[PDB]
């Protein structure tokens, strides 16, 4: 009840930034998580004991692959506590609540293989569910840990908050699946330009949720130029992973997911940052303005792999 966690005073400072990296002491990353549930949700929240269980049962079902790990988990739900914190009275007690936990159990049990490959193996997962495949398992995984015997941390809302709160969780952990991503910021882009946004229409919050969601899976390239290099290393490792298990099948992986191109890796981040992370951050910055930190360094990070592919780094 009176049980704060406190950081250190450097980590107590530079976690309310956006840019924010939680440093490579897996031990501080539950303290980490509880500390910003407290200060973006409240002391009285979750029963701590509850929580503690969850965030350890949540850490357990992450796997040890280069990239969708538990340090993934954590990073995405900070990039979320930075974007409630500077926009305190645009959500919900419930949505403050959802969203952080559902960051964290966003890529639950992830293998580090694509929705595609899962497709072209023929995974049982991809026969259970025919989109959003890992998505949907994701979220199957987040159920079954809250059913676990003292695990259920939403036990003292009512059966309406309840239904409530997992359906906000449902549609979060859908909507990090990047196949979705394009379509829900076009009809965001038209919405604010046309006017008819509107932040009280349940379906419009939906969106508006589903791209932060996009934005937070995204914040590697919102840090730092040498985390985001350093974590470009983990997102490539598990790529090419994944081209080598597609040759296995017999089927020449696209290029970004083949170890024998490396070279063209630059020109593909641009690629990326201007097709996928720049409109993203974009549109999250004229729907939620105080964003605009996340666009900026976008942008900054933009400009180093310009440098990296002219020979000045
Ligand atoms: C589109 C393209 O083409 C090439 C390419 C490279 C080398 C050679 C030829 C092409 N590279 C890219 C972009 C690489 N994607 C990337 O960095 N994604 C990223 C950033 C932050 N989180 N995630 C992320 C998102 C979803 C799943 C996993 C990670
Ligand atoms: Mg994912
Ligand atoms: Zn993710």
Not at 193 to 209: A, E, F, M, P, Y
Request: hydrophobic letters at 40%; charged letters at 20%; a negative charge.
């Amino acid at each position: 009840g009176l049980m704060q966690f406190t950081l250190p005073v450097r980590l107590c400072k530079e976690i309310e930034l956006f840019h924010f990296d939680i440093g490579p002491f897996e031990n501080m990353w539950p303290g980490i998580f509880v500390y910003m549930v407290h200060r973006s949700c409240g002391t009285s929240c979750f029963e701590l004991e509850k929580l503690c269980r969850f965030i350890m049962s949540v850490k357990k079902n992450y796997r040890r692959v280069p990239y969708h790990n538990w340090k993934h988990a954590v990073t995405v739900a900070h990039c979320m506590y930075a974007i409630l914190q500077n926009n305190h009275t645009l959500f919900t007690d419930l949505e403050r609540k959802g969203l952080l936990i559902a960051c964290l159990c966003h890529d639950l049990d992830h293998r580090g293989f694509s929705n595609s490959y899962l497709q072209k193996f023929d995974h049982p997962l991809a026969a259970l569910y025919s989109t959003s495949t890992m998505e949907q398992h994701h979220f199957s995984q987040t159920v079954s840990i809250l059913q676990l015997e003292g695990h259920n941390i939403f036990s003292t809302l009512s059966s309406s908050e309840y239904e409530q709160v997992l359906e906000i969780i449902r549609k979060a952990i859908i909507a990090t699946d990047l196949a979705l991503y394009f379509g829900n910021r076009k009809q965001l882009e038209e919405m604010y330009q046309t006017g008819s946004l509107n932040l009280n229409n349940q379906s419009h919050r939906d969106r508006v949720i589903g791209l932060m969601m996009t934005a937070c899976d995204l914040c590697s390239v919102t840090k730092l130029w040498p985390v985001t290099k350093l974590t470009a290393n983990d997102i490539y490792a598990e790529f090419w992973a994944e081209g080598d298990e597609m040759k296995k099948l017999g089927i020449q992986p696209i290029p970004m997911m083949d170890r024998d191109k490396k070279d063209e890796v630059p020109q593909g981040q641009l690629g990326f940052y201007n097709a996928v992370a720049i409109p993203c951050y974009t549109t999250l910055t004229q729907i939620l303005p105080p964003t605009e930190p996340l666009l900026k360094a976008c942008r900054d990070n933009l400009s180093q792999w310009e440098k990296v592919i002219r020979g000045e780094e």
